[PDB]
Amino acid sequence: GKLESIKSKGQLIVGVKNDVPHYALLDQATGEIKGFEVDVAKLLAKSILGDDKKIKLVAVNAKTRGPLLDNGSVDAVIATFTITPERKRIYNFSEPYYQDAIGLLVLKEKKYKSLADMKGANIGVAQAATTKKAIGEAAKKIGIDVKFSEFPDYPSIKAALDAKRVDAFSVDKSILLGYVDDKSEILPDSFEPQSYGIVTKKDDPAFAKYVDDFVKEHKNEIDALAKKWGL
Ligand SMILES: N[C@@H](CC(=O)O)C(=O)O
Ligand SMILES: [Zn+2]
Ligand SMILES: [Zn+2]
């Protein structure tokens, strides 16, 4: 299995985001995705193959990352993949390497000050993301009703926000920072913390152990990488 196939290919294939500043953001001038998560991926490649250059990055989103893991087209996913009990039944997750929290991105012209001002709001969320469940509960805890519109990817939610087809775009603040602009704002409110793990197909206990041990045993190096990226 899986460590052996990686050695045989001579390459670790990792699914990463391409739109998250400081974590994994495509630098279009160089055609390379750069950030903390990419640096963690390179450290894992170095651990397995002895060389951080022996890696291939595949851009994924919340919808596509699962299927690419399922069919073996990536070996691991390091792509803001929130650990949840439901997801742990489907995939293996390492212990967390970082944590963020869900936020709300809204047009400045709405003059929303907090979620409490958003009764009746249509909130745009991604298909396959944790967001709908978390914001629903946040809203219920302060006694307001909201509705949701689901989208296949993040650029489409931002376009919906700009067109006023939704009243807010909700997801991890890490991701919202990749979409905020002069006409919009991320509210100060923070919601359910999102703990991110390195995700592997449930195929292979040995590889899951390797990856979990990696996060634990390279914790200091990973934390230093977070600092280098401003995290
Ligand atoms: N972190 C969130 C959103 C995302 O990764 O796109 C999730 O795992 O659903
Ligand atoms: Zn920044
Ligand atoms: Zn090690």
List residues, by chain if needed, whose CB lies under 5 Å from ion ligand 3: 47, 217
Q: Which residues contact 64 (CB under 8 A, 6 or more apart)?
A: none
On whether the CB atoms of residues 85 and 195 are closer than 8 A, the answer is no
Separation of 24 CA from ligand 3 center, angstroms? 23
Residue found under tokens 């009746």 = 120
205 CB-near residues (< 8 Å, 6+ apart): none
For residues 183 and 203, membership in a common domain is answered with no
Pocket test for ligand 1, best of 125, 175, 191 (most atoms within 8 A of CB): 175
Q: What is the CATH number of the domain that holds 184?
A: 3.40.190.10
Residue 80 beta carbon below 6 angstroms from any ligand 1 atom:
yes
Task: State how beta strands 98-107 and 168-172 pair.
Answer: antiparallel
**Residue 226 and residue 231: Cα distance in Å, rounded?**
5
103 and 183 together in one domain: yes
Please tell me the distance between residue 15's alpha carbon and the centre of ligand 2 in angstroms: 22
Q: How far is CA 216 from CA 212, 219, 220, 221, in A?
A: 6, 5, 9, 10
- One domain, residues 4 and 45: yes
Q: Give the number of C-alpha atoms closer than 13 A to the C-alpha of residue 222, restricted to the C-beta side.
A: 21
Atom of ligand 1 nearest to the CA of 194: 1
Residues 141 and 102 in one domain: yes
Check whether residue 92 and residue 205 sit in a common domain. yes
Q: Is the CB of 14 under 6 A from ligand 1?
A: no
Q: Do residues 170 and 62 lie in contact, with contact meaning Cβ atoms separated by under 8 Å?
A: no
Longest CA span, the chain: 57
Pairing label, strands 76-77, 12-16:
parallel
- Spatial contact of 208 and 216, defined as CB atoms under 8 Å apart: no
Resolution (A): 1.5
Q: Hey, whose CA ends up nearest to atom 6 of ligand 1? A: 62
How far is it, in rounded angstroms, from Cα 142 to Cα 130?
19
Ligand nearest to the CA of 126: 1
Statement to judge: residues 202 and 150 lie in one domain:
no
| Residues of the domain holding 38 | 1-96+198-231
DSSP characters over the chain: -HHHHHHHHT-EEEEE-SEETTTEEEETTTTEEESHHHHHHHHHHHHHHS-TTSEEEEE--TTTHHHHHHTTS-SEE-SS-B--HHHHTTEEEPSPSEEEEEEEEEEGGG---SGGG-TT-EEEEETT-SHHHHHHHHHHHTT---EEEEESSHHHHHHHHHTTSSSEEEEEHHHHTTT--TTEEE-S---SEEEE--EEETT-HHHHHHHHHHHHHTHHHHHHHHHHTT-
How far apart, in Å, are the Cα atoms of 223 and each of 81, 136, 174? Answer: 18, 32, 17
Domain count along the chain: 2
